[PDB]
Amino acid sequence: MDPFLVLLHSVSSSLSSSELTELKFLCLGRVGKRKLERVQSGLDLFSMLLEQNDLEPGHTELLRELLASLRRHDLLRRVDD
Amino acid sequence: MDPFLVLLHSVSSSLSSSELTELKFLCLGRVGKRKLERVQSGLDLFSMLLEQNDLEPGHTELLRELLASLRRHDLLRRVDD
Amino acid sequence: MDPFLVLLHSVSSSLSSSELTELKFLCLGRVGKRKLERVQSGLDLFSMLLEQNDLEPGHTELLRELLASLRRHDLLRRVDD
Amino acid sequence: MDPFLVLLHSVSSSLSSSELTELKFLCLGRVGKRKLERVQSGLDLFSMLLEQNDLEPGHTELLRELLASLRRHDLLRRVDD
Amino acid sequence: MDPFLVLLHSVSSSLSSSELTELKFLCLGRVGKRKLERVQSGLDLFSMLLEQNDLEPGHTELLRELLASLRRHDLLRRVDD
Amino acid sequence: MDPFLVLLHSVSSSLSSSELTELKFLCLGRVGKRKLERVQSGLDLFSMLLEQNDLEPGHTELLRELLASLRRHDLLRRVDD
Amino acid sequence: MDPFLVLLHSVSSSLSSSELTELKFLCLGRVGKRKLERVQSGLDLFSMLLEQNDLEPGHTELLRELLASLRRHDLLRRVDD
Amino acid sequence: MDPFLVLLHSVSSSLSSSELTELKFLCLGRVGKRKLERVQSGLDLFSMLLEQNDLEPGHTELLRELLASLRRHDLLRRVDD
Amino acid sequence: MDPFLVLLHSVSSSLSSSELTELKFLCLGRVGKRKLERVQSGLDLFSMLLEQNDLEPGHTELLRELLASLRRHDLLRRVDD
Amino acid sequence: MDPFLVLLHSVSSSLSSSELTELKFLCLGRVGKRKLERVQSGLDLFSMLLEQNDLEPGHTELLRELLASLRRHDLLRRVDD
Amino acid sequence: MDPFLVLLHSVSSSLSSSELTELKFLCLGRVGKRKLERVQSGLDLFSMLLEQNDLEPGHTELLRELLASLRRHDLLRRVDD
Amino acid sequence: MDPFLVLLHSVSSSLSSSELTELKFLCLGRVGKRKLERVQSGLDLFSMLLEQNDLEPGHTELLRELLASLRRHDLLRRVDD
Amino acid sequence: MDPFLVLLHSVSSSLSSSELTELKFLCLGRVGKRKLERVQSGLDLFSMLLEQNDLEPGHTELLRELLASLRRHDLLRRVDD
Amino acid sequence: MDPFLVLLHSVSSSLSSSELTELKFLCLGRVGKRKLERVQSGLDLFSMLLEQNDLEPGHTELLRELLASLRRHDLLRRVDD
Amino acid sequence: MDPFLVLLHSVSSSLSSSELTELKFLCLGRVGKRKLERVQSGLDLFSMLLEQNDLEPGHTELLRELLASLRRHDLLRRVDD
Amino acid sequence: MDPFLVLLHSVSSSLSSSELTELKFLCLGRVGKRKLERVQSGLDLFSMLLEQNDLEPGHTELLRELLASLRRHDLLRRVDD
Amino acid sequence: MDPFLVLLHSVSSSLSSSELTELKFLCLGRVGKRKLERVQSGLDLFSMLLEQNDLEPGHTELLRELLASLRRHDLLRRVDD
Amino acid sequence: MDPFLVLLHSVSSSLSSSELTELKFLCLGRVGKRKLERVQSGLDLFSMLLEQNDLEPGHTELLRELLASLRRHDLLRRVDD
């Protein structure tokens, strides 16, 4: 298994419904409304970000900034930030 | 590639399920019920409007009127309206 | 576009979930239970009323009566009543 | 072309899957099961009714009453009712 | 058209999803599971009961008692009960 | 419109949450618990009573008796009681 | 025109594709696989049964048993059973 | 922003709980009990009056009467009375 | 119809959402999670128990003790207890 | 008519789509993928097992173990197990 | 990330339920009732305002007026006003 | 109506908040804490006692004992005690 | 190479199965059923219409009106309509 | 049935909303936030702990100390402490 | 279980409504208003301080400061101060 | 029957829709998106893993790590881990 | 083997049903409707584009543009874009 | 009986319709379109590869390569790869 996938799964397991709505709002400029309507967990949003080359194992800045905006520093400890 | 098709794809990417239902309702007089039942995205509706000569690169006032009724002025910005 | 459909869309845009519930209740004698279960917005109800000849541009007394029972005189203003 | 055939085509254009299933159910006594299993549109049903002399330009009562049972008075306006 | 088929259509029109589920549950001993998984409306169930000689214009007792178990006396008034 | 449905809607418009709870309690022997759990307004209860033949335009003593137990004589005035 | 042939034709007109597959399965021990592969309607199967002396105007027991296994009692009324 | 909405908001911000109960009592004949039970601020009552065409930017007599009955002349200075 | 099926239907009619959740919890050892996630009413649970030979007209002890654990003795009176 | 064929037909009439997929999965080591792709009912799978001498009137162990894996003990009562 | 989106998120995180209700009341003339019924946070209202071209990164007058009506000058310091 | 339910409603209408608290305390050994927390009126407690077979038209000694501990002899006169 | 044959080929290239079915239905009075059952593309129908002198480079009205009935105005632009 | 499951049901029956909140708080390190947001009763938490191998009929120490921290010794008597 | 979570639970047990209000007031600069409006016990505040990395088993200074400002030295004895 | 197939079936019967979606997310790097879109149960995913030599009776490490990531230790007891 | 064909197969393996629908829509001006109806996977579309000289090993700008419009940059990395 | 032909038959028996389509796509450069259109099973493709000297008992690199591109390592075990 990729450690990147396990890290994404662990991050997704620590996010609630309100946090998911906030993350969807903060991703409005990168993911279209039609695609955003189908997102029911952090895994789907991470998949769309992976497809758009906005999120990679070596490209994690956007995820860190999303987590900082949500004020989840405990989750940022997982990304080692 | 035709910029007209790219514009139509972009417009269809910004629309949700309720907006698609509203668009289907407002087109009841131009498209039959049998043809309207098969539409699952804005692309199918735009293609049918193209076939019936209701929508061309020089014929866009029906699309602008529909987008105005949907109260989506950001989407009218893409059509330069 | 037909002004009749624009008017119906505008009327449906001003109605809430409870108002839709009382609209469905007051139409129990004209629309069957099987068809009434599939209605999620006023657009579907208006389309069924159009299909059964209960609602036409020259046939609006049923709609005016339903809006009167809902005690929505601002909505009757749109129909000029 | 025959305006009878054009009228039949126009009627078949304004029908959905559910209406087709109900029309098939209400014609069980006149068409066999083997022939009814091949009907995928109103056109095939109309052709089979034509073959059995149930539907002619001078013989439209069965079509009229089938449309009445489906509560499609707008469709009956095409048949002058 | 037969008044029997019209009566069956009228009865099937006044039923919702839940009543259809109960009707399927209460007919488990006469219809196999493979045939019951293909019923999406009261019309299919009525046709299946017709094939097995369980429902005729002169043989309606199973229909009346199924309607009684669902506590639909208004529906029984259609069957004159 | 049926004046019966208008009367039922008017009666339901004058009832509060506690009165709805008392009505649900007093109807425990006629409506099952599963069906009683889904009632959020007097309209649902009245429709269920209509289905079970407990309430018709010529069948109103159950409604009058229930309103009498609620000590709502102003509401009995609407039913002419 | 033989009444037996007309009866066979009428029976075959009331059987669908699935029933034909079940009938072919139930006839595996009497008709070989190579011959069964060419059967596209009940008429071919009836002809093959006629050749093997399993089906005669005075010998209708196998057909009755096949119809009873398919649970088509309405079709058994045609064979007078 | 409508000056009417701002005026309504300013009026509502100067009314307390007892004043709200008195206003609800004085509005008993115009708003039903079921709707009155959901009013938790002057804004909900004002919106309900707006729906019933009892209160408009050009129709403010009822609001002045309500404020005079509450003996709030300071609030009447806002409506210029 | 079988009195056993009617009895099961009557028992399932007097159950609410919470009791269904408790019944699902107390049957974890006999039904898998995949099959339990598809149960939306007591009828589906009863059918699943029927398939596994856990509930027959001569085999009712599991149902009796499941009802006992929910403290529904009135329901046990239907099962003669 | 073979009692074995009638038993196989009765078993097949009690199996749904999901059960058919599970049975196909459990038969992967005996029937090839190309042959498994054409199976649309339990009858085809039973015939394929019949050809490979895995299923006979005197050889019913594999069918019993398949039914036990699906946890259909009611169906095992048909095989007398 | 757009600084505009981060500013909107920070504004929304400083508004309570009562402030949300007041903001919904003050936005009655621009957003329909059906759409207003689905707003559960400031983010949804901001999204609807963004769709309508009433709120843009270069168009912040309406938001300033809304904040001034709510008397949140501390929040107006975020918009630099 | 059952006179039993009318009697229970009348008894519940004569009780105050403190009396309800004492009734809930005295029923600690028969109703669980989870179920006791949801009781807001005597009707819910009476229904729970009815379900557990603690209270029937022929089983009223528990109710009489509870009313005697509350020192409400006027309420015991309604139960004829 | 004839521009008439090239035009017919270009028209036949922009048609799907459904439009071919409607074209066959609307030509029932000019082509027999025996000849229509052998048409698998628009080219066969065009050839048959050519043989019966219904379609020539100077005789296009039937093709024009057939394309009109299918609501293909873009296709009529090829025929210069 | 398992007396383990019966014991778990009995323990969950004697818990209130506040105790469930404390139980959720004290299990933060073993269950993720996403999974804890879906727990509405002690049964959900117990099943979740069962999945992670934290609670078995031979593994009851975590439950014992969770009950101890809530100061429920009467509940510990059920687990025989 | 973690001694840290047990300590937090013990601290939250010895607090009343007024102390919770003071704790909410003194944490205004670290938690938003929307998040603070949803705190009904010290557990929620502790959880949110945990998320923002303000409180860890190795980071307890802010908790000590909050307890000191409330003049609860007995509570500081639990934190070993 | 292979014990490996029975073990896979038993594992698949204990996984819900959410667990299946997490398993699909964790298998993104090994199974392509086109193939992943057709997976509707654990059996299909297990078949795809078997085809790619990622899962064998002697090769069960990937399945163990998948189950450990889902935190199903009870399911890991089935694989003897 | 041609690396071009392996690359095309790999690209087609990463595409879903919706992405195929958008690809077919964006190719409306180069491939006819009759040829587009027969495409069930990206392989057929790529073969048609190869046939019309729209796609060659030295001619890949159309493919790169189509992948860019689909917003699949990971799929552009395979084509080295 | 040649072991090479037995191996080819066994390989062809484990392939499905989609896998055959991908095999036909990957062999576009070696087999013409006219010869590829007549292939309905892997046996025909293998025979054509045998004729063109692309596949011999000592020449199996093309077959191994094709099976590797199909990601069928279990089928590569049959060829000992």
mmCIF file of C-alpha atoms in Angstrom, chain H residues 6-66:
data_model
loop_
_atom_site.group_PDB
_atom_site.id
_atom_site.type_symbol
_atom_site.label_atom_id
_atom_site.label_comp_id
_atom_site.label_asym_id
_atom_site.label_seq_id
_atom_site.Cartn_x
_atom_site.Cartn_y
_atom_site.Cartn_z
ATOM 1 C CA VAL H 6 -34.496 48.062 7.618
ATOM 2 C CA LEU H 7 -37.407 49.799 9.353
ATOM 3 C CA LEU H 8 -38.964 46.440 10.233
ATOM 4 C CA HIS H 9 -35.631 45.187 11.595
ATOM 5 C CA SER H 10 -35.155 48.321 13.714
ATOM 6 C CA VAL H 11 -38.694 48.012 15.089
ATOM 7 C CA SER H 12 -38.127 44.340 15.923
ATOM 8 C CA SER H 13 -34.866 45.091 17.752
ATOM 9 C CA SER H 14 -36.758 47.332 20.217
ATOM 10 C CA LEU H 15 -39.371 44.761 21.305
ATOM 11 C CA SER H 16 -39.012 42.402 24.263
ATOM 12 C CA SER H 17 -40.545 39.030 25.127
ATOM 13 C CA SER H 18 -43.666 40.373 26.855
ATOM 14 C CA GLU H 19 -44.265 42.797 23.987
ATOM 15 C CA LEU H 20 -43.928 39.865 21.583
ATOM 16 C CA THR H 21 -46.534 37.860 23.509
ATOM 17 C CA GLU H 22 -48.908 40.840 23.518
ATOM 18 C CA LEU H 23 -48.418 41.297 19.763
ATOM 19 C CA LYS H 24 -49.098 37.591 19.202
ATOM 20 C CA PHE H 25 -52.298 37.873 21.247
ATOM 21 C CA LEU H 26 -53.419 40.911 19.240
ATOM 22 C CA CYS H 27 -52.771 39.027 15.966
ATOM 23 C CA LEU H 28 -54.845 35.951 16.871
ATOM 24 C CA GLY H 29 -57.635 36.686 14.395
ATOM 25 C CA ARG H 30 -55.276 37.061 11.418
ATOM 26 C CA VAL H 31 -52.631 34.347 11.961
ATOM 27 C CA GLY H 32 -53.556 30.785 12.846
ATOM 28 C CA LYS H 33 -52.511 29.078 16.059
ATOM 29 C CA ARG H 34 -50.255 26.563 14.289
ATOM 30 C CA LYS H 35 -48.338 29.365 12.551
ATOM 31 C CA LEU H 36 -48.278 31.537 15.684
ATOM 32 C CA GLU H 37 -46.649 28.734 17.691
ATOM 33 C CA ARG H 38 -43.495 29.024 15.533
ATOM 34 C CA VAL H 39 -42.971 32.787 16.023
ATOM 35 C CA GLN H 40 -39.858 33.500 18.097
ATOM 36 C CA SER H 41 -39.166 37.116 17.077
ATOM 37 C CA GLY H 42 -40.918 40.087 15.533
ATOM 38 C CA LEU H 43 -39.311 39.223 12.193
ATOM 39 C CA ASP H 44 -41.297 35.993 11.785
ATOM 40 C CA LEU H 45 -44.554 37.772 12.635
ATOM 41 C CA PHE H 46 -43.715 40.583 10.205
ATOM 42 C CA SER H 47 -42.957 38.087 7.430
ATOM 43 C CA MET H 48 -46.233 36.258 8.094
ATOM 44 C CA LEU H 49 -48.091 39.577 7.901
ATOM 45 C CA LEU H 50 -46.217 40.345 4.668
ATOM 46 C CA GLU H 51 -47.400 37.083 3.096
ATOM 47 C CA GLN H 52 -51.069 37.764 3.918
ATOM 48 C CA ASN H 53 -50.907 41.259 2.337
ATOM 49 C CA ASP H 54 -51.799 42.754 5.736
ATOM 50 C CA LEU H 55 -48.490 44.667 5.811
ATOM 51 C CA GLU H 56 -46.806 46.420 2.870
ATOM 52 C CA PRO H 57 -44.511 49.416 2.331
ATOM 53 C CA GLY H 58 -47.627 51.301 1.222
ATOM 54 C CA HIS H 59 -49.910 49.513 3.736
ATOM 55 C CA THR H 60 -48.726 50.244 7.281
ATOM 56 C CA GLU H 61 -51.999 50.953 9.126
ATOM 57 C CA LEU H 62 -52.127 47.619 10.969
ATOM 58 C CA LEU H 63 -48.561 48.049 12.230
ATOM 59 C CA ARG H 64 -49.396 51.511 13.590
ATOM 60 C CA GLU H 65 -52.505 50.109 15.286
ATOM 61 C CA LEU H 66 -50.458 47.318 16.878
#
